[PDB]
Structures are given as structure tokens and as C-alpha cells.
Amino acid sequence: PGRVEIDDVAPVVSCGVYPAKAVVGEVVPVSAAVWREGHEAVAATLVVRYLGVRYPKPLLIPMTSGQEPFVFHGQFTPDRVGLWTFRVDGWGDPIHTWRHGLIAKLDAGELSNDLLVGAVLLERAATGVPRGLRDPLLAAAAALRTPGDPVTRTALALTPEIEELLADYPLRDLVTRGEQFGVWVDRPLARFGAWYEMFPRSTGGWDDDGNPVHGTFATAAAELPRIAGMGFDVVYLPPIHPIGKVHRKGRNNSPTAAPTDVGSPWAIGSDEGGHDTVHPSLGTIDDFDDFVSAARDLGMEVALDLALQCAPDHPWAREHRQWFTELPDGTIAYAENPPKKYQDIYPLNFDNDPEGLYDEVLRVVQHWVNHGVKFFRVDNPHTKPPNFWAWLIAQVKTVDPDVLFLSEAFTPPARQYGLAKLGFTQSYSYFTWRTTKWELTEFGNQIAELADYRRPNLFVNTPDILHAVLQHNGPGMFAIRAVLAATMSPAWGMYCGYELFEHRAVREGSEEYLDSEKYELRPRDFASALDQGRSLQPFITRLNIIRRLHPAFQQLRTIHFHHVDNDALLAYSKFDPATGDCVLVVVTLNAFGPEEATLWLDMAALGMEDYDRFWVRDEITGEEYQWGQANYIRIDPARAVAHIINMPAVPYESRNTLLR
Amino acid sequence: PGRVEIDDVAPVVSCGVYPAKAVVGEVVPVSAAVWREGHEAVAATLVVRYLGVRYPKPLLIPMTSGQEPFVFHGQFTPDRVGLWTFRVDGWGDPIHTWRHGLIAKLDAGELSNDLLVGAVLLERAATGVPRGLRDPLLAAAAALRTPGDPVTRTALALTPEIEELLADYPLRDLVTRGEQFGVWVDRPLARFGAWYEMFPRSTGGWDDDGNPVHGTFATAAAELPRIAGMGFDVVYLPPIHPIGKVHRKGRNNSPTAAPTDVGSPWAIGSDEGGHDTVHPSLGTIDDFDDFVSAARDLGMEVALDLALQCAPDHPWAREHRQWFTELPDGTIAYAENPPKKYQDIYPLNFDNDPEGLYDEVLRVVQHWVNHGVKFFRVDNPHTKPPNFWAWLIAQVKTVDPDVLFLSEAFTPPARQYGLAKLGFTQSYSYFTWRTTKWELTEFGNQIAELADYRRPNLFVNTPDILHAVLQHNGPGMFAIRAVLAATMSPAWGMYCGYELFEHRAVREGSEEYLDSEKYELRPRDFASALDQGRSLQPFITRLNIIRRLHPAFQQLRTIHFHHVDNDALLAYSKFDPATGDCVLVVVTLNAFGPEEATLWLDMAALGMEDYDRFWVRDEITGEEYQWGQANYIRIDPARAVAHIINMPAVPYESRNTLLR
Ligand SMILES: OC[C@H]1O[C@H](O[C@H]2[C@H](O)[C@@H](O)[C@@H](O[C@H]3[C@H](O)[C@@H](O)[C@@H](O[C@H]4[C@H](O)[C@@H](O)[C@@H](O[C@H]5[C@H](O)[C@@H](O)[C@@H](O[C@H]6[C@H](O)[C@@H](O)[C@@H](O)O[C@@H]6CO)O[C@@H]5CO)O[C@@H]4CO)O[C@@H]3CO)O[C@@H]2CO)[C@H](O)[C@@H](O)[C@@H]1O
Ligand SMILES: OC[C@H]1O[C@H](O[C@H]2[C@H](O)[C@@H](O)[C@@H](O[C@H]3[C@H](O)[C@@H](O)[C@@H](O[C@H]4[C@H](O)[C@@H](O)[C@@H](O[C@H]5[C@H](O)[C@@H](O)[C@@H](O[C@H]6[C@H](O)[C@@H](O)[C@@H](O)O[C@@H]6CO)O[C@@H]5CO)O[C@@H]4CO)O[C@@H]3CO)O[C@@H]2CO)[C@H](O)[C@@H](O)[C@@H]1O
Ligand SMILES: OC[C@H]1O[C@H](O[C@H]2[C@H](O)[C@@H](O)[C@@H](O)O[C@@H]2CO)[C@H](O)[C@@H](O)[C@@H]1O
Numbered sequence A, B: 001p002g003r004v005e006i007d008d009v010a011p012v013v014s015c016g017v018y019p020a021k022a023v024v025g026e027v028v029p030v031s032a033a034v035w036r037e038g039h040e041a042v043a044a045t046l047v048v049r050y051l052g053v054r055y056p057k058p059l060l061i062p063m064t065s066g067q068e069p070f071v072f073h074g075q076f077t078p079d080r081v082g083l084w085t086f087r088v089d090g091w092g093d094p095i096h097t098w099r100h101g102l103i104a105k106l107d108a109g110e111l112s113n114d115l116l117v118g119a120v121l122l123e124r125a126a127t128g129v130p131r132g133l134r135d136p137l138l139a140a141a142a143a144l145r146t147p148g149d150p151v152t153r154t155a156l157a158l159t160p161e162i163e164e165l166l167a168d169y170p171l172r173d174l175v176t177r178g179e180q181f182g183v184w185v186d187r188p189l190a191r192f193g194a195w196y197e198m199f200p201r202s203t204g205g206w207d208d209d210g211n212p213v214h215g216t217f218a219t220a221a222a223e224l225p226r227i228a229g230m231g232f233d234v235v236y237l238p239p240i241h242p243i244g245k246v247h248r249k250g251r252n253n254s255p256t257a258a259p260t261d262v263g264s265p266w267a268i269g270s271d272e273g274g275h276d277t278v279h280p281s282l283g284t285i286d287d288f289d290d291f292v293s294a295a296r297d298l299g300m301e302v303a304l305d306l307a308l309q310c311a312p313d314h315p316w317a318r319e320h321r322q323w324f325t326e327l328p329d330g331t332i333a334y335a336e337n338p339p340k341k342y343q344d345i346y347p348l349n350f351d352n353d354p355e356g357l358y359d360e361v362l363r364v365v366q367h368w369v370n371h372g373v374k375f376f377r378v379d380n381p382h383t384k385p386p387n388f389w390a391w392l393i394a395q396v397k398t399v400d401p402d403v404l405f406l407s408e409a410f411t412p413p414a415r416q417y418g419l420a421k422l423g424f425t426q427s428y429s430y431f432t433w434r435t436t437k438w439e440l441t442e443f444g445n446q447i448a449e450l451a452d453y454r455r456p457n458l459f460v461n462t463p464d465i466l467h468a469v470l471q472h473n474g475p476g477m478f479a480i481r482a483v484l485a486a487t488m489s490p491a492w493g494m495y496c497g498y499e500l501f502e503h504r505a506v507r508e509g510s511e512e513y514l515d516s517e518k519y520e521l522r523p524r525d526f527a528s529a530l531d532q533g534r535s536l537q538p539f540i541t542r543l544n545i546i547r548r549l550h551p552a553f554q555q556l557r558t559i560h561f562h563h564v565d566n567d568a569l570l571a572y573s574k575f576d577p578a579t580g581d582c583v584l585v586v587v588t589l590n591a592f593g594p595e596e597a598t599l600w601l602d603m604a605a606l607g608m609e610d611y612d613r614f615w616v617r618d619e620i621t622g623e624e625y626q627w628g629q630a631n632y633i634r635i636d637p638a639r640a641v642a643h644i645i646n647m648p649a650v651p652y653e654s655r656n657t658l659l660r
């Protein structure tokens, strides 16, 4: 009735309600506590199996004891997409009990009894191994028959052919089965990729006069190489749907729209079309299909903004009206967040006609899926029912499992981290409003930590957020945030124009871009900026190449912070369990002054003893240096705001430093 | 479905496999995280119901939001022994949504629409309240259907008359019910009581010559008043069973036993009897019944050592030999811990004849339960199968639920704390080997929050443990540990002779009492020590009185440590959620020197603002003083090694100072 106890198993999420998250080729660490009566030794074997794909022959991996007694650790690396299962099985290994006990008493060294007990072990042990190589067992099983010196037949106890033999085929006693938990593996882009947010309309390129010109998918596609050139793996496009014509918004959040103004893309829908139609000015849907294929040619993928909202002109406003929250006087209520108003849209109502709306939205998501779009940016997901997301998310991947979702949830923790739990492959974070060494240090450790179920996407900016620190610290700071986002997380992102050092907010104390891109056409000339040397495009490229270069940067779990005695300096390191690759990042939070300090290292964390000395190389500088536990470091902006340092590869003791 | 989200419920143990622990009249704090779509407000109601006894119509308590968004906290206080159940139910309260939304918009200040929506709510709400006082809502509902002032029907919202009944009877929408978890409540002695350990035989009192004399229950009962006099609630007796005559141990763990020597009581069993018989030299079983009844007259309870072990001459050795571990040569193995030998006892074998041993031991426990013994100190339980204890425990408590078990498990955490999870009402701890300011600090804080499954019993000493710090720091230290034990835990204990300052170890570097009572008979003359002023009995008495006096000391959860800028000084405070009682303890760890420092307080923890100044009284000294956030303290041993301070009672905001 449960003789051997198994508890505090990890990774488990919400006590097993939600599966943990991992990706292909990621080392997944498993741990559990196994114990039994007295001083009889115990061991556990971790059993992993890969099932179907769904969502709502065993493989055996041996587990190893560790620092803390009775807690056993293991790892496994999943090789195909779908839903995996693991469980921990616990058993008592008498051989270990017998062996360890015997070595202590042999020291006292007659006693003839314990030896025979061993002798009956290997025989019973032997039945488990096939007659073929079982023959050193009978050597051991016929090892303490006859009287003699102690080192008589222990001689077979100690040689590593039968320790190795017992390893492949073990003597298992009192086997007890553990609980089963599940892991959901996604394609690697779920963890490691870089984002670019661009407006297709802004690819217009001016007219014969000064006036901005509306772009098209065709014009948009011309800018795709340059993006790929910077190393981004995913291109994110704001909604490509028709914009409502009533209450269309003007320049600067103005209530009244000029006849030519475009209005914000998130005001989805018009007499012209719904969520399933391309806004005609961009082109026919074939042009889009053509646009996707261009990106695909460059190694990139396309992600569309998915905003479950409607403009008044949206066909649903006419076709299906049960889907909204209707006021008492027959008017239809504008989407609302008190007392501020976003007048150009309608909130959906998920309670009046649930299976009605559910099936239609699924149809729509499926539409774009059929057109090569396999990454969606769910918009303001926290203002829609959770169970819906749990359903919609689970529903799409089961027919096709390579579709991934990103949650734009700027919301308090319980909701933000909560949403991740229900299936979102990625989530936005509070990253932008973390700017002090202490916010960032705890934040870095925080990310993650939550890796078993949350993978964060760190965005340096979004059309709605230009943090104050970018406003007054000048072009230097833009580098700093880029270094932080790119290094802290495998997944990071950027909004267009960031590369131009766009740092002007509409008015002081606001976080909205002046002459915001949501309401106006803004073609930009990146090439000229490059020529006059006022673009951060080369640097970002160098940042993006480096992450791809070092697989250490694709890890969530292994971030570790090292001590630097300067409030303005931040130093942390990441490593890869697989290749042993190891990297240390040192950045300044001060854009303005040269800063110097003494850097102290936790050598154990890098896999070396404290007195060691080793050589490092700076991937930006190319400089090589000799280092030890304590090293001198000085950072000078207007030369380089950060040092990305390559460190000696962590020995094949990588696996235990990943533990927990 | 679940339409509304419920997560991170606490207190839950091992994801619900094991019930949490609590006792009667203890405030049990419950917390959970509840959230839903958008800015619509949400609330939760905690539903508690009391089930039967067993082990392996509703009452409703409203839950309140707090500092951290979306996490709701609640409490309930169980009033009868048995198994309780609780679950969290989640719902959306539209009024709150409507109310909070309207107040923000009212400042903008026509609005003609929102008011009717409220008005259709309050009416929909009226359906929930029972014919009679239902009506001012309809009054509130029809006071703006009429056009008018904005402030006109806010009138009917404004009034504290309308926050009302709705708290008592609420309008609940989209109600979703949470998972169910269980709590097992024991009698209060499970948490709060003090222990005294005595050898019945040591109550012998010499003969006409100098020679010590073996005692009896009769003689043992003579020492019971003085024990009660010191305030102890439980008397713990080493096994009272017959001691084996074969391989019986001599003075000082000597291998050979003299003819008169008594042997260790844990060497259970002889030709005279087994576990079901009283050792005859102590008396007839009636004498025991008389002794137990005697203690109960004094307000005490009797606790017997439950040691699953056998001497060679034990009846089981012949009667049932399947129950033992028989060697290959037919001998049966002596108790063993490699390479140490415990020649006087036999380990049991729980695998050969499981239902065989299970059934005898349960019978044995029931024998003594029938004789008024409802507390057992299970001996070295970690050297017996886990599942067994889980079985034995659930089996005993269902017939009689007032039987409680204490686990002497000096074992690594996973096992020690693990064992507590299975049902052990109390557990021994690592307390004796914590002697530095940081260790005691960590240990005290550590007590919590494991309160949900572990209640620690802090023993200053046992026959097996005479700590080094006691060895050289003189009688002063003995006070210090007593203060630490009594204050840190609601439940604490003492082994006989401690009060006489017995401080001599067998050899330097050992933790065993010289001329140990386990192997030798040791009568003591407590009275003479009193006259000659070398007894810590008065002080201990004052300590136990103080504990009973302040109910704050019966709490596990609320211990909090305050900063004192001295490495030799330790200051912590406890309070009682019920009466608001609050107490602060300051103790010194150096027995030899006067020590002084500046004591800093976190007033918020004590329920006061930082600037407040207030009056306190020292329960040992008796005089009143005035204090503030920072106060001067100096401690002089050889007058008093600690200050136990009565502090201003925590206001009726105790409950919120308890969250999580
Ligand atoms: O060439 C690179 C550089 O060029 C441009 O800067 C030029 C600039 O136009 C010119 O006027 C001049 O500027 C002065 C500057 O006005 C002075 O204020 C002086 O800055 C010092 C400053 O007054 C100090 O307060 C000091 O504060 C530091 C902190 O010590 C740091 O901790 C850090 O604060 C961070 C903080 O730790 C966090 O907790 C969080 O709050 O976030 C903060 C990040 O801002 O940084 C602040 C401010 O840096 O720092 C300075 C001294 O250490 O410096 C100039 C006097 O020479 O200098 C430039 C001409 O060479 C362009 O604006 C820059 O973007 C570009 O990087
Ligand atoms: O009369 C009442 C009094 O009588 C007895 O004590 C007398 C004692 O027999 C007598 O010898 C004398 O004591 C002397 C002592 O011999 C000297 O050694 C000296 O003691 C100082 C000591 O050398 C210092 O190292 C200093 O150490 C403190 C630490 O500062 C504390 O941090 C603390 O250490 C704890 C530590 O923090 C933890 O990490 C952990 O390791 O546990 C430690 C606790 O053991 O305690 C030690 C010492 O307690 O403390 C002394 C500085 O004054 O000077 C002494 C006299 O100046 O004095 C006594 C009477 O004459 C009887 O044993 C006492 O119980 C009784 O109160
Ligand atoms: O849809 C028009 C509206 O867009 C923005 O408002 C939302 C929108 O859902 C997303 O862009 C997302 O970022 O959140 C925004 C704020 O909740 C604009 O902020 C707003 O000016 C515009 O009317």
C-alpha cells in the first residue's frame, strides 16, 4: 500500500493540472525525493514516454543521488514534438546496502555471515541478466563459498565490469510506481528567436511630393532582406485587416479623423471585410501568401496580431449581434475601461452565444493557419475569458501542433503568470519598467525560475511604450536595453524605428510615441541613417549573431548573477548543458559615464575551483585576457557599453549544475 | 469550464495526498488566487464543512482581497475534533464592477445608461433576499429610474445600509467551485504541552545502607506532584516492559552485565513477558492503572515509549520467528547500524509476515489505549517502513481519535519532515545542534510554515543527547536553552536531571550522559538541591506558568524575529490571533558575559506605526517601561539570562497580520 515514498516531484505545474513546458533539444531536469525504512539504501529510475500529439515501449533513465540526501535527480532530452510523459519509479537496491555495509565492517575484519548474504544476492541478481554475459556474476555468486582471507573474492566486488553490468541490468527490489506527469514540447522557436515589429503600410516610401505613401505587401517584401540581415527569426505584423471608417482616429489620438488618415489597425473590421479578409490597400490575399513565402525564403517566419475586438463597421456588428454586450437603451456599448475611452471598438461578449463565437473564432484562426501563419500575437488576452483561451489554444494545436501563441498580458502576476499556465507558448513581461540593478538582478533570477511553465519574450519597446529611461539618457541607453533583452532571454523583441533612436514621446511623462505610428503613415529611410552613422542596426546585428553563435544563450534556466562592487554595473552568466558552452555578460546601467569596478566570480558555478586561472575572449572586441576569481573591469560608453565574454566550456559536470 | 479560475490554494500538503494539521481553537489561515477576464471584479467564498472522525449543511466564510492583487485570504476556527474539509468557490460580483466603475466616471460627470444597468442588478439581487427586508433595494432600484440628479440614487448606494445584507446574502454570477482539501484537527495537547521524561525505577530512594534501590509505580507516583508543580502537561516514560537477561548491558555500555544490573528498558522482552506485560518489579498492571489515574488527577497525561524492538529472550523470538530477519546460517541478526552493534536487541522483518506483525502490534497499542494512555513516543520510526506507520496510525485513530503519536526521527529532512506528513502529531527536531545566532534564527523561522504538517517538540536534552554547549557553559546555559525551547515552540520537553544541572559527559567529545540512566539505576534528591540552591526547578516553573499565561506562546505560525545589532543577542516575538495577545522574547547566547545592544523593531509586524511609543512589562522582573521603535537592552547573567516581555495586544487587525 505504497511502501516506498515518492514526493516533491519536479517539474510539476499546478499540482499536475497543466503540463510543463519544454522544447526540442532542451535538457529537461527532473528531481524527486525517494526514501524508505532505515539505513537500507534506495535508488530511483526515471521513466519517460512520448505519446501522441493531442493536448488535454517505455524509456528508462537512471537517476543519481545528489548534495541533499534522499533527493534524486535526472534529466531527459525530448527529440520529437508532441506530448510527453514522465514518472519516477522507486526501488531498494540491496546490493548497494550490502556493499556499503561490508566495506565498513571489513575495516574491522570471522564474521563469515554477511559474505554469504552477498553470495545469494548476485545469483538472484543473475537471473535478471541473460545467460550470455551473466558469467562474471556466477564468478561473484560463487565468490564466497569457501573460507579464507577477507580480500578473497571482494576482488570481484570491486572491479568495474560487474558494477557496469549491474548498471545495464539492475537488481530491483520493492519496486513502487510514482505518479505520472506530462510535458509539452514545442518547436525550438518557442524558446529561442528574435522579433521585429513593422508596419506594412509604412513601407510606402514617399511620393513625388513630400507626403507619406501607403504601402503594400509588395513594398513590404522589399524590406524583408534587411530584417533578415539583422538576424531576426520572426517578423511580426500588426493586424492586416480593414479599419473601421466611423470614429476613425486622427493624428495624436485626435477624436476626429481627416479624410485621408488611416486610423489604428486594431480597429478591426468594415463593410469592406472582417477578420478573414486582407485590407485591400495592402493587396489581395494572394499577395500576402506571396509575402509569407518571401519571408520563409529568408529563413524567417510571419506572426500576425490577433485582436478579438470589432470596429462598428465590422460585419459581425450587422451579421451577428448576439456576440456583443448590449446596453438597456439599444445603443451598443463601446469597449470600455473606466473612465478612459477607446471609442473605435466593440468588446465581444462570450456569455450570450459561446459555442457560436467559439466556432467562428476558431474558423478564423484556422484560416490564416492554412496560409502559412503559425505564430499568433493574442492581443490584450487578459480581457477575455481564460477557459476560452484554454480551449482555443488546445483546439488549434491538436489538428496542427506547430502553432504558437504569444500573450500580451500587461497585468498583475496572478493573471500574467496564470495565463502562461493555460498554454501560451510565450508572454510579455514587466521588463520595460525594470531599470535598477536590484530590479534587474531579481528580475533576471525571476526569468526563470518560471521556466518550467513560462518562456518570456523581452521587448525593448512596443508602439505603446517608450520608457522614460530611453527619453533622457540618449543614444547610449538604446544599446544597453538591447544588450539586456537579448542576453537575459533566449526570446527578445523589437519595435520598428528603435534602430533610429526614436526617443521622443508626445509630451513629458507619457509613454506614447509622438506622432504615433498607429494613427499616421511614417515611412523611414534606414539606409541614409546607416550612411550618416546614426543607426544602431549594425550593433543589433552583432548582438543577434552572437546569440545564434553561442547555444548558452538559448537557455532559460541557467542564468546566474556574479558580484560586481558597483551600483552601475551588472554582471551575469549563462551556460549550455549540452555543449558546455559558457558566456558572461557585463553591462553598464549608466549610459553616460565610464564606470570601473572589481568583478568577483562564483567559480563553482562556472565549473572551476576558486584558485583557477583561465583565458577569455570578447566577442565584440576580439580582445583576449587572462582571468581568475577576481578581475578588474572598466566599461566606457561611446566605445562599448557592454562586454560579452566567452568563457572556458563547463566540463562534463554540466548536468548537475542544471539541477532543480 | 472552469469558466472562472482557481489556483495556488493553501494550506495544501503534497498536492492534497495528505491532510493539513491543526488543533481545536487554532485559527487556520486559508489563501488562494482567483482572477477572471478584464476589469470585472471577482470575489471568493471559502466553504467549510465538518465531516466525521475516520482519517484516510455547509458553513460559509467570505474571503477578502489584500495587498497582492487577486489573492484572497480567509480563516476558520474548528471547534470539535475530527476531519474537516474546505474548498474555495469563485464568482464575479457585478455590483462591485458596476459600483467601482461608476464612481470613477462620476468624477467626469447624460450618463443615463450605466444607472439603469445598476438598477436591473439590484432588482436581480432582490430575488436573492427573503420577503420582508428585501424592499429598500427596490427602493434603491427605483430611485433613478426616475430622471434626476446623479447624486440622487447614489444616495441609496452611499448608505452603509446597502453594503448590508448583500454581504450576508450576495448576488453570485458564473459561480465555479474549487478543489477540496482536508484538515485533521487534534486535541490542543497535540500543539501545546510540556514534557517531562522519567525513569520509574529511579524513584527508589536508597536503602538503610548507601546502595540505590529499584523503584516502583507506587514510588514513581510519589514524584508526580512536584512535576505538576513545575507546569508540565505530559509525563513520558521509557519502556515499562521487562528487560532481557541475555547480552544485557553493563554500567557505561559495558558488554557484560553484573547480576544486579537492570539493563536498558529498550531491550524489550524476557521469559517473564512481552510488549503486553508490565515489568513485574514495577508492579502489577493495576499499579500502572493507578499511576495513570494519579497523573490525570493532577491534570497530566501519560505517554509511553513505543519501541518496535525485541530482546533475544523476548517471547516473539520463539513464538513467531517469521517476524525476524534470519541469517543464512539460521541465526537471527542482532540489531545493526554498520559498523556499530546493538547486541541487546533484534530488528523486526516487516516483509516475511506483514499482516502477521501488523495485527499483533495494533493489538498491543490497543491494550494500552484501553488503559488511559493516548500518547505514544514512537521510537526510531524511520528505521521501520513508512507505509506501516501510515497504516498503524489511521487504524488506531479511527477507533479512538484522541490517540496521538510523536516521532523520534533524527534523520535527514526528507525523511524527518516526510514522516510528519504521514500523520505523526509531533516530531523531534534538530534543535539541540543549533547554537549560533544565525542557526537559531533560521530554525525559529523554519518552524513555520511547516506548521501545516509538522509540530516540533523541542527537547533540551534526552538520555542520548547531552550537547557540548551544555558541557562547558555552566548552569547559566541550561537556563538559556530552556528559554529557547519553551519560547520557540508551543510544545517543548525535558529529560530528568536537567534541573539538577547534570553536566558531566562520559568522555570529552561524546554526547552521552556519564553513568547513563539507560544502563544504570539513578535516584536523585531534588528537594535537597532546592534547599542548597542548585536547582533550576523554580525558573522552569515560572517558564511554564508564563506559557499558560500568554496564549501567544501556543502559536506555531506567528513567530517573528526582530533585529538586534549584537551577534550574542537574539530577539523574537509571538502573538495570538484570537485574543490579540503579543509577547516579545530577548535572550542571550553567552552564559558568561553581560551583553548590551540597540534593539530595532518592525512595528508593522506588531501592529503599530513606526513612530508609536508604548509601555511594556517584563514577566520575570515585573516592572513596567516605555519603549519605541528603537530601544536599549542589556542582559546580565547571574541575575537573569533573558527578558520575557508583555507587549501591547495586537489590535483587531491580527488576522491580516497573519496572511499566507
Ligand atoms: O558620448 C556618449 C554619450 O554622449 C552623450 O552625452 C553627452 C551629453 O550630451 C553631454 O551633455 C554630457 O552630459 C553630462 C551629463 O549631463 C552629466 O549629468 C554627467 O552625468 C553624470 C550624472 O550627472 C550623474 O548623476 C551620474 O549618474 C549616473 C548614475 O551614477 C548611474 O548609476 C546611472 O544611473 C542609473 C541608475 O543607477 C539606476 O538605478 C536607474 O536609475 O537608471 C539610471 C540610468 O540612467 O547613470 C546616471 C546618469 O548616467 O552619471 C554621470 C557621471 O557618472 O555626464 C556628462 C558630463 O560629462 O556628456 C556627453 C558628452 O560626452 C549622450 O547624451 C549619451 O547618450 C552618450 O552615451
Ligand atoms: O557567575 C555567573 C556565571 O558563572 C559561571 O561563569 C563564570 C565562569 O566560570 C568564569 O570562568 C567567568 O567566565 C569568563 C571566561 O572564563 C572567559 O573565557 C571570558 O569569557 C569571554 C569569552 O572568552 C569570550 O570569547 C566571549 O565569547 C562569548 C561570545 O562573544 C558570544 O558570541 C557567545 O558565543 C556563542 C556564539 O555566538 C555562537 O556562535 C555559538 O558558538 O555559541 C556560543 C555560546 O557558547 O558566548 C561566548 C561565551 O559565552 O564571552 C566572554 C566575554 O566576557 O570572560 C568570562 C568572564 O569575563 O565568568 C563567570 C563568572 O565569573 C557560569 O558558567 C555561568 O553560566 C554563570 O552565568
Ligand atoms: O484599437 C484602437 C486602440 O488601439 C490601442 O488600444 C489598445 C489595443 O487593443 C492594443 O494596441 C493594445 O496595445 O492595447 C491598447 C491599450 O489597451 C491604442 O492604445 C488606442 O489609442 C487605440 O484607440
Ligand SMILES: OC[C@H]1O[C@H](O[C@H]2[C@H](O)[C@@H](O)[C@@H](O)O[C@@H]2CO)[C@H](O)[C@@H](O)[C@@H]1O
Pocket (backbone or CB within 6 Å): B249, B253, B264, B266, B267, B342, B343, B344, B345, B379, B380, B408, B463, B464, B518
Ligand atoms: O535501545 C537500547 C539500545 O540502544 C540505546 O540507544 C537508543 C536510545 O535509547 C533510543 O532513543 C532509541 O531511539 O535508539 C537509540 C539507538 O541509538 C542505547 O544507546 C544502547 O546502549 C542500547 O543497547
